[PDB]
Amino acid sequence: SNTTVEAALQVAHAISTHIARPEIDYFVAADDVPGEDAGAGHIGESMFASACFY
Amino acid sequence: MLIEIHMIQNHSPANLNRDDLGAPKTCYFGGVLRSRISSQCIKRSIRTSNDFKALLGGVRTRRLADLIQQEAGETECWKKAQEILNKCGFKNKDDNTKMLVFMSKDKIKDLARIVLDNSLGLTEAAQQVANVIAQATLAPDIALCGRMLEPNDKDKDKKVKWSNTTVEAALQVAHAISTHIARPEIDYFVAADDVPGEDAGAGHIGESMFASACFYKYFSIDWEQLVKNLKGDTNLAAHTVGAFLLAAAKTNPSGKQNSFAAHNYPDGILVEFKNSPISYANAFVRPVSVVKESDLVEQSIGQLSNYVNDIRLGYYDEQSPVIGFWFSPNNRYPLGYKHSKLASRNIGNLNELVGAVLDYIGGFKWEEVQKSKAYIG
Amino acid sequence: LAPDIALCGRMLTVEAALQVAHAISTHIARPEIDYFVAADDVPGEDAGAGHIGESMFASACFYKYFSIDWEQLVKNLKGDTNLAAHTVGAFLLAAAKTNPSGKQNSFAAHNYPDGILVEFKNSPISYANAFVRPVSVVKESDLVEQSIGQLSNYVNDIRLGYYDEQSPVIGFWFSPNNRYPLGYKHSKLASRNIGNLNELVGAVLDYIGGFK
Amino acid sequence: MLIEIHMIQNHSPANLNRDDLGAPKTCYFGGVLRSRISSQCIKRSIRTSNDFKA
Amino acid sequence: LMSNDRYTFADRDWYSPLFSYLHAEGNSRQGKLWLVGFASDKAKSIDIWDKIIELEGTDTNDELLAQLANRATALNAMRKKPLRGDFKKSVGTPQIADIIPHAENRIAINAGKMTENRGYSWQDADTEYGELLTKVAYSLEPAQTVDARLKRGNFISRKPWPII
Amino acid sequence: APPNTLFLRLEGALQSWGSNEAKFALRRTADAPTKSGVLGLLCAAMGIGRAEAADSWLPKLANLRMGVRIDRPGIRWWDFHTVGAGQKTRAETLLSRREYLADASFLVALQGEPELVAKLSAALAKPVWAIYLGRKSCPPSRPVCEHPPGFYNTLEEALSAVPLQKRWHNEPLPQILPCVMDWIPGYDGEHAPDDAEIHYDLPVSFQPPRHLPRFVIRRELVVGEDVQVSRETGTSVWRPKGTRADYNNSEYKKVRAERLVMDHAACMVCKAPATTVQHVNYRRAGGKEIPEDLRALCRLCHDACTMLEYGSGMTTNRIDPCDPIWRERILAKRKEIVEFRSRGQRFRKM
Amino acid sequence: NRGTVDFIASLENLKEGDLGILRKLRGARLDEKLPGFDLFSALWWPLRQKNQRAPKREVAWLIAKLFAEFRFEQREGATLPILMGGICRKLEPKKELPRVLARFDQLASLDIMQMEEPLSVIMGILRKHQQVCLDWVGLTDVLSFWEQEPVKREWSDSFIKAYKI
Ligand SMILES: [Zn+2]
């Protein structure tokens, strides 16, 4: 039978009120037990941003 | 006499018209890629709205027998109604479906009273419904879009006579094109299981496509054709013109609107009365590019004003001039860069704009032409 | 003695004067397709049977060429030179402000010429060889300006190669409000660059015999 | 005397001439395909026009 | 004159009668062949044409000759295929139908070799469409992106398919 | 030496030379100009009507030997042409198809009597009537009277004294140039050869059109040994000038000093000792600018002006400091520079 | 070119302090912060006043910021389409490859102002796959002459040649 219900709520995407400024965070995990500190690596990339949304 | 409407609009990230692949509709103009809203989308979304409700005197369907059956309150004659329709000329395409028929909602009572009559045969019934279908061209929406109904004849037994079923259109809507280059984008979605315990993992990235654009829209209404289409009703024509302008100003195609909600409004409406139609789409052969400080809409309106001034100074004839009004919301966007003004008026309210348009067209009032009410249902 | 018979030709000896040629674009043709759906006003919500169709459209910058025989038109009117001048002016207005009627109720391409050049010469020619390289658009230009620039370059080359021989050529380049000049310097590539259709018709009429 | 008229005209997305199938009319020149409006279509628009009737 | 369903106008129907005439006591050379073709529907006459063919070759296998006398259906099947795939009742690519009568006139130059496979073949004739399908594909996929290049590469490879 | 042959160049965007196989609706070009085709072009050049040409002008003109050399052999394009009957009387529409030769070039050589050739060449420089290529909807793209006559020899020699013109740099060329020539008598080969085809292009009359058969032979030519490839003239691809300004050539270095003396060593807006010059109109640069295009400024004000036009999208008309509308923004940028600049960084970088 | 080579050499001549100065300014214009304007002017203006065909201000600013955040050694024959083709021919062709292809193809519809962030995304993909080289000069020239057709044709052709090895 009819399994279609018209939605009664309209939600728009939230866009910022200014030019976006993405930023990159360079995390590095640390070994609790001491080891060999010769190029531990694990330079990561965490993208984030702060904005005033409408 | 022609009434032309040129509008500049800017839309939020959305998807108002898509092709078979789901991507937004695009086109090529000036050697670059634009964004497009098809003209049949604009016409349908205008004629099916809360602002055009009183003038929706037409209908477009293949299930005319279902309309006949729902017009009565008995077991009806549903099978022989389809047999009569097959006898008419609306033959099944590859033994499937029907042919689109545009007809007024008023004259279905004649169809009900003729098909149900038992004092006749199938051939005479088919001829009579053909005659009453060919004379169902009195509606505000059928007077603008126009009609062309022609049977394939594969089922014309030289027994059903047909007549002039074509109605010359009065409204020519252009395809809306973006004033800048087109930048489509892909939204990525994942449907999440409501149960917290999944005990599984697999990538199920979906694909949705959207775009944001500043659209230039162009309309054209033939006043003398509308009088002939409506048999000589000036009041009904004026009401249709005013309601069409008010609907086109404050409506949007109901595409993917439950998920994007992009009900934006135009930032400029220019209405001009002319003798020959002119389009200003050549203003945007050079695409609009944003600069350090600019609205996209302000730059687009400036380019439009530059080209409008160039055309007015270039194609000028004292035998038939052009007078036009420019409307912006509370004069937010003046026509130009506060220089080289052209418009004979500067309206700041939409209702005043429609009133001025009607006043120039026939001296009518908007509160006066609302008395000409068509079929509502 | 009607203008519609003498100039255009027979309704359906009587040799005409017009030489309307095929209008050929100045760039690569880009045909596009549209997937329309014949929607139903009655909802129904059953028996879909998909109504997907296809309709093709295109957008282009056309170069159009016309010719008029003055002696043939005069012989067709048997001496009414004022009527011949009036018919030439009427055609100059009409061919500039008339578009084909094919599918204009759904696309409404009521555009206007971005430049008209009227020339007088002994031998006939068409500047179709100017756009042997398709026009490619760059950052600080649009398609119309580049097409007009290629036309200017070809006119410059022709007037450098085919000129003099006791036969100077005369140009009457026109553009709406002079927004598209035909080249820069080089004696303006023609005679006066004017910015009104009525002024163009008047200039041609006063050149032919000093008519009205 | 031979008056010659040359015009450059950019058009909106449209379909002004058609084949027997429905596509816009084309031609070949310079090594590519070019959109074409036929000669007899242009002569029919200039003739039988309200400008040419007034 | 009109291109409709199950027929794409290609002109010069020389390949049509080169099976029945070469099947009933006619499989000789006798110099060069000459075909006179008059085409009409019911009462209205449509066209008259003729074709000469150098026919000093040997005998031919019946299967390849029967495939040769099906070029009209092969070209209609070529034209009816749409651009990206829609089916229903589409006219396919009408821009292909514009280049068919030129490619068929180039094939007809070597019509004597084509019939008896004495230096020509259907796969040899398939290379004539390559010079023009690239020019069609540059117009059908005008974008300078990367997926457009792959679309052009897939569109270039269209060749007629021999069926009986 | 009196001229012997005459040269005609036939080249346009579209052209069509019809043949006898066009009988009911389908109209076909053959491959090349025919004798009857070019001897209607010559007849329309000297203004001879359809009547009065059959009895007098056609028999003398048909007494010629002509040959056609083909370059850019052309791509046949078909056109769906409808003729509307009505708009006998009916609303019917007649359909037909017409063939055209797209992107083609033909060189025709006609050889005969000297004074007839001279009269024909004199007529072609200013034709009486309109000249087209087969059908009236096909005008030439190159002038027909483009090559001079001369006292040449038989048609193979006459079809070798014309260069093969090109149009752009990477224009592909054919190694072989096929040519079509009329057959030649001489009573040694009095009978027609085996490799001779028959064409129906010998005109007799035009108003009740009458054509007669003519034997046609075919030959070939190779570029580099008989015809030398020429080169195009002029410029095809058009680009805007857009001269990027240079600060090293002598002319600008003298114009800048002349401007720096025109303004008495003072910055324009802040009135300080000027050390640099800023342009206003950029459409003269490269070493051709005038002193009125340049304005003297100091370091602070020119840095402010550079900041104020970084991403403003100004192509030719840049910032004019003498304009009293740009004063406030220049002053605000100058205040920002005074407040936030560090002399140490600039001193360290140089 | 020579202005581009000198510009790249000057950019690689920088130390950690000036690289941090440029790194703090990603996503910003040139006429906003005085230290960035001073550093870029002192790095670029002598080259512009010497060589007539030096890169434009916007292109040079964009390359300066991209070098600040995504420091790669300059090498010849390591253009962006070649490395994108080398990376792209290692994933499954059903889901991930169309996504990366769409990301690479977005660049053809963008002008030079709105191109720092997609290029940053592409270079982040490059950095995630252990890349330590790039051709900065060729990218600078391609960005300088971008709205033309042959440059985009060569871009896509190089991508196809790297992808179909
Ligand atoms: Zn100062």
mmCIF file of N, CA, C and O in Angstrom, chain B residues 309-334:
data_model
loop_
_atom_site.group_PDB
_atom_site.id
_atom_site.type_symbol
_atom_site.label_atom_id
_atom_site.label_comp_id
_atom_site.label_asym_id
_atom_site.label_seq_id
_atom_site.Cartn_x
_atom_site.Cartn_y
_atom_site.Cartn_z
ATOM 1 N N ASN B 309 21.924 49.617 -21.095
ATOM 2 C CA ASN B 309 22.245 50.948 -21.598
ATOM 3 C C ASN B 309 22.806 50.886 -23.012
ATOM 4 O O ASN B 309 22.444 51.708 -23.864
ATOM 5 N N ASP B 310 23.681 49.910 -23.283
ATOM 6 C CA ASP B 310 24.245 49.769 -24.624
ATOM 7 C C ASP B 310 23.167 49.463 -25.657
ATOM 8 O O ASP B 310 23.170 50.034 -26.752
ATOM 9 N N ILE B 311 22.233 48.573 -25.323
ATOM 10 C CA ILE B 311 21.157 48.237 -26.252
ATOM 11 C C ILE B 311 20.229 49.428 -26.461
ATOM 12 O O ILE B 311 19.819 49.716 -27.592
ATOM 13 N N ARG B 312 19.892 50.147 -25.385
ATOM 14 C CA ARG B 312 18.982 51.282 -25.508
ATOM 15 C C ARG B 312 19.593 52.399 -26.348
ATOM 16 O O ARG B 312 18.901 53.027 -27.157
ATOM 17 N N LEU B 313 20.891 52.657 -26.177
ATOM 18 C CA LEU B 313 21.534 53.680 -26.995
ATOM 19 C C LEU B 313 21.771 53.196 -28.420
ATOM 20 O O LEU B 313 21.793 54.008 -29.350
ATOM 21 N N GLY B 314 21.942 51.891 -28.615
ATOM 22 C CA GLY B 314 22.237 51.360 -29.930
ATOM 23 C C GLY B 314 21.019 51.110 -30.791
ATOM 24 O O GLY B 314 20.952 51.582 -31.928
ATOM 25 N N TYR B 315 20.052 50.358 -30.270
ATOM 26 C CA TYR B 315 18.830 50.043 -31.007
ATOM 27 C C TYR B 315 17.721 50.974 -30.524
ATOM 28 O O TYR B 315 16.826 50.591 -29.772
ATOM 29 N N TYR B 316 17.788 52.220 -30.982
ATOM 30 C CA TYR B 316 16.848 53.259 -30.589
ATOM 31 C C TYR B 316 16.065 53.722 -31.808
ATOM 32 O O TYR B 316 16.650 53.993 -32.861
ATOM 33 N N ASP B 317 14.746 53.809 -31.659
ATOM 34 C CA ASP B 317 13.868 54.270 -32.725
ATOM 35 C C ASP B 317 12.724 55.058 -32.110
ATOM 36 O O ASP B 317 12.041 54.564 -31.210
ATOM 37 N N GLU B 318 12.517 56.279 -32.601
ATOM 38 C CA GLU B 318 11.478 57.152 -32.072
ATOM 39 C C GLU B 318 10.072 56.711 -32.458
ATOM 40 O O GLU B 318 9.105 57.196 -31.861
ATOM 41 N N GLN B 319 9.935 55.813 -33.437
ATOM 42 C CA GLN B 319 8.615 55.321 -33.817
ATOM 43 C C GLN B 319 7.998 54.462 -32.720
ATOM 44 O O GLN B 319 6.784 54.524 -32.495
ATOM 45 N N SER B 320 8.809 53.670 -32.021
ATOM 46 C CA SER B 320 8.306 52.788 -30.968
ATOM 47 C C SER B 320 9.330 52.724 -29.848
ATOM 48 O O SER B 320 10.282 51.935 -29.898
ATOM 49 N N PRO B 321 9.166 53.543 -28.814
ATOM 50 C CA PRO B 321 10.095 53.506 -27.682
ATOM 51 C C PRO B 321 9.734 52.397 -26.702
ATOM 52 O O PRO B 321 8.768 51.654 -26.876
ATOM 53 N N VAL B 322 10.545 52.302 -25.652
ATOM 54 C CA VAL B 322 10.368 51.319 -24.590
ATOM 55 C C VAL B 322 10.400 52.039 -23.246
ATOM 56 O O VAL B 322 11.255 52.899 -23.012
ATOM 57 N N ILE B 323 9.436 51.721 -22.387
ATOM 58 C CA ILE B 323 9.357 52.271 -21.042
ATOM 59 C C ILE B 323 9.327 51.123 -20.043
ATOM 60 O O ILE B 323 8.553 50.171 -20.179
ATOM 61 N N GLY B 324 10.198 51.203 -19.041
ATOM 62 C CA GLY B 324 10.321 50.106 -18.099
ATOM 63 C C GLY B 324 10.525 50.578 -16.680
ATOM 64 O O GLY B 324 11.012 51.684 -16.432
ATOM 65 N N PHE B 325 10.151 49.710 -15.742
ATOM 66 C CA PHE B 325 10.302 49.961 -14.319
ATOM 67 C C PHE B 325 11.272 48.955 -13.720
ATOM 68 O O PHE B 325 11.344 47.805 -14.158
ATOM 69 N N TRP B 326 12.017 49.393 -12.714
ATOM 70 C CA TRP B 326 13.009 48.560 -12.048
ATOM 71 C C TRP B 326 12.624 48.427 -10.583
ATOM 72 O O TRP B 326 12.433 49.435 -9.897
ATOM 73 N N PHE B 327 12.508 47.192 -10.109
ATOM 74 C CA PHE B 327 12.107 46.912 -8.739
ATOM 75 C C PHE B 327 13.233 46.195 -8.013
ATOM 76 O O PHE B 327 13.796 45.227 -8.532
ATOM 77 N N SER B 328 13.556 46.673 -6.819
ATOM 78 C CA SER B 328 14.482 46.026 -5.906
ATOM 79 C C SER B 328 13.872 46.101 -4.516
ATOM 80 O O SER B 328 13.105 47.028 -4.232
ATOM 81 N N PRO B 329 14.174 45.141 -3.632
ATOM 82 C CA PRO B 329 13.575 45.185 -2.291
ATOM 83 C C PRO B 329 14.084 46.361 -1.474
ATOM 84 O O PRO B 329 15.229 46.355 -1.014
ATOM 85 N N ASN B 330 13.217 47.364 -1.290
ATOM 86 C CA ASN B 330 13.550 48.620 -0.608
ATOM 87 C C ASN B 330 14.763 49.299 -1.241
ATOM 88 O O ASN B 330 15.607 49.868 -0.544
ATOM 89 N N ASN B 331 14.839 49.236 -2.574
ATOM 90 C CA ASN B 331 15.917 49.841 -3.364
ATOM 91 C C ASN B 331 17.292 49.373 -2.896
ATOM 92 O O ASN B 331 18.242 50.153 -2.810
ATOM 93 N N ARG B 332 17.391 48.082 -2.579
ATOM 94 C CA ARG B 332 18.656 47.520 -2.121
ATOM 95 C C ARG B 332 19.698 47.522 -3.231
ATOM 96 O O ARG B 332 20.879 47.788 -2.980
ATOM 97 N N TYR B 333 19.282 47.236 -4.462
ATOM 98 C CA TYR B 333 20.190 47.125 -5.604
ATOM 99 C C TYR B 333 19.747 48.052 -6.727
ATOM 100 O O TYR B 333 18.876 47.680 -7.533
ATOM 101 N N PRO B 334 20.302 49.257 -6.825
ATOM 102 C CA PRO B 334 19.943 50.147 -7.934
ATOM 103 C C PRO B 334 20.518 49.653 -9.252
ATOM 104 O O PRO B 334 21.529 48.948 -9.297
#
